[PDB]
Symmetry: D2
Subunit: 227 residues, 4 copies
């Protein structure tokens, strides 16, 4: 696609999130860059309102699948890049098993030379001392496959996966993600055959940073198609 | 699961289809056996009403995913066998791109020692000299991945994939499958995490058979989960 | 490769083996066809000297990897078709754990329009009532990955894998395969990056065949490269 | 038993003495690994000054014991089985149309630290080539690392081919021939054939003045379901 050409090098990224979980309001700003050639992202996020009222790992998926590496033999299946520069809307509901849910809406588009992800998040029905509001999730992250299908009637894609968040007591908290992406612009996009994205995420801290924050490094690679 | 034990050896299979495509009525009977230990199926189908009014390859998917091989580390994700012996209802719409569609409903269950697949099929809006009613498909079959997701809210699974049917002029006819599977019985069943089945199908003819028929050998293996 | 073009359709196959295992001399003739577009082989083998003195499954690997399906994105890695029509020599040692070994030399090449596999096999040091000469192997077959690497100095490849043969008492007999393939002709061949072949095999009988025999259907697909 | 040593975060030390076409250098590295996620974080410093070869050419030389082996493949993890006593890792790396590295390393626990001590000899490099001429980009591709048992040495043989992107758009290949053997007398796990899928991110420390490399790696075993 034409949008693909915008990703051949290193692209600066900005992330902005306005959040409300059980009435606790908060904001996060992020910045970094993406190198889709290697399917690699580097981002740092800061809670600018003080302490983040939910665990950092619960927000990883919310904080730019246009940086996925699509191998050459799968390049006609890259919806994300095909929607650029005008972008796409990404909406999710994330159901935390035996707990509350997040609902998110984001616009992912170029603003000048920068890929910008602007999100609104609303979380409801969380348990005051469940794993989320009780901060019981470990500061780590597992590898996942993100399943993608075309949604022709909406000129976009439907996406589903289930994050496994390790809890401090040895158990796992699941977070079931129902996701849709739809183009912002009117130009044609690539609607894919079924496939998946293999995703790895490394969370760390900036030793020079005193605010509540998260450093993220991600690798994302499309797979599953040989026709 | 309990139902898993029913598939440790060779199980006889019967298949019965009653069909109507654009008003053309037909019946097909099938028989053979499955060996889920190897993900292997061998079946022969006969059109008992005369000539089959659609190409045999378009019915391959319609004609027992309980015979899939689930490797030991994925056995908790085998919905199909866990629903046995009482079985499951399998419903599909199959959309032939630029052509008509099949809607099917099937009960797959043990009747005595035999696994029985009883199907009703209705096809509508087919073009009279399209690839299907014009018999323009080659007698062959590609390898496909069948994507499975849980639908817990509806007590079953949702399955999606797109068959590529090779056409006699070198093009491909796409057949987009939307499938739902629901237990028939009351007992506990396994709802899987997202995964796929890798499917290969060999079509052939019985040299001693003068009626319109298809011999089918399949291998199906589950993949995609390491957690 | 130029040799690739010889496999775009269905290609008849002939197999001939002369064997001697612990002094037991036997001969097997086989015939059928291959369709590399689908990675598919169908073959029937007959022991023309009487009863086979070793179990049929032990000879499956010996009885045409040129019929593998190489996906379009991996076609530069298909050594086997590149060596045609002049062909290649395939040599193996097969070490049956806690038992004897087979040593084989085969020529695989076109003779007219037919792909012929002509093999000499020598087996030594088998135990008289071990799993092999004692006929304790089940008539079935598991799926395997066949690992391929280039051998630049021999202008060919080196191949390794270990077959798991199921035994009648529930155990497994291992057969470790050390394999080398070299071109017969002096024309250019394709030397691959490391990859593997995913292989599935279905063994059956011809109900109207009174001779000692085996019917074989195989699917083979190359994988492991996206660069 | 060696498995048990990797359930949590394990500090790492790396020490390399090198000589490439007579150019002597040393590198010290440190960080940690978390095999539960197959994840490594390491920082390397050239302590002798400028590194005389590109940082990417040394990535594979600078602890496969931190690979994630999924539960169904745990019987195939040679690397951890050799711990704490360790293994020797030897390689020849052939750079196509250029010279070669030969390495010998001991990888073992020294107290609670996993330590990788390497000797590297490089020869027959072209002074104007991709390596000594510093024409490799500061990046890294994903690779599969193919492992087989070597029963008669009671270890493994490993082969793969690194693709290093060149500053003009071409690729410099580095064919790795690798062998690992136990240092101790204890039993080890000899695996069935399989591979490790490897991803590597190279970066810089914005406050580090010395010639250095920051590396993050993810490594996961695959290919077995029997």
């Amino acid at each position: 696609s034409k949008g693909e050409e915008l990703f051949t090098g290193v692209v600066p990224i900005l992330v902005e999130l306005d959040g409300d979980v059980n009435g606790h309001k908060f904001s996060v700003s992020g910045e970094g860059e993406g190198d889709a050639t290697y399917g690699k992202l580097t981002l740092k996020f800061i809670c600018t309102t003080g302490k983040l009222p939910v665990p950092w790992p619960t927000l990883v998926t919310t904080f730019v699948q246009c940086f996925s590496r699509y191998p050459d033999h799968m390049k006609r299946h890259d919806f994300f890049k095909s929607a650029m520069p005008e972008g796409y809307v990404q909406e999710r509901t994330i159901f935390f098993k035996d707990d509350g849910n997040y609902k998110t809406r984001a616009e992912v588009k170029f603003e000048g030379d920068t890929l910008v992800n602007r999100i609104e998040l609303k979380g409801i029905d969380f348990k005051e001392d469940g794993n989320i509001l009780g901060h019981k999730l470990e500061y780590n992250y597992n590898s996942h496959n993100v399943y993608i299908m075309a949604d022709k009637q909406k000129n976009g894609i439907k996406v589903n996966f289930k994050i496994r968040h390790n809890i401090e007591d040895g158990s796992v908290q699941l977070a079931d993600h129902y996701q849709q992406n739809t183009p912002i612009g009117d130009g044609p996009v690539l609607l894919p055959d079924n496939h998946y994205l293999s995703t790895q995420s490394a969370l760390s801290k900036d030793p020079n940073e005193k605010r509540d924050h998260m450093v993220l490094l991600a690798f994302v690679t499309a797979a599953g198609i040989t026709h």
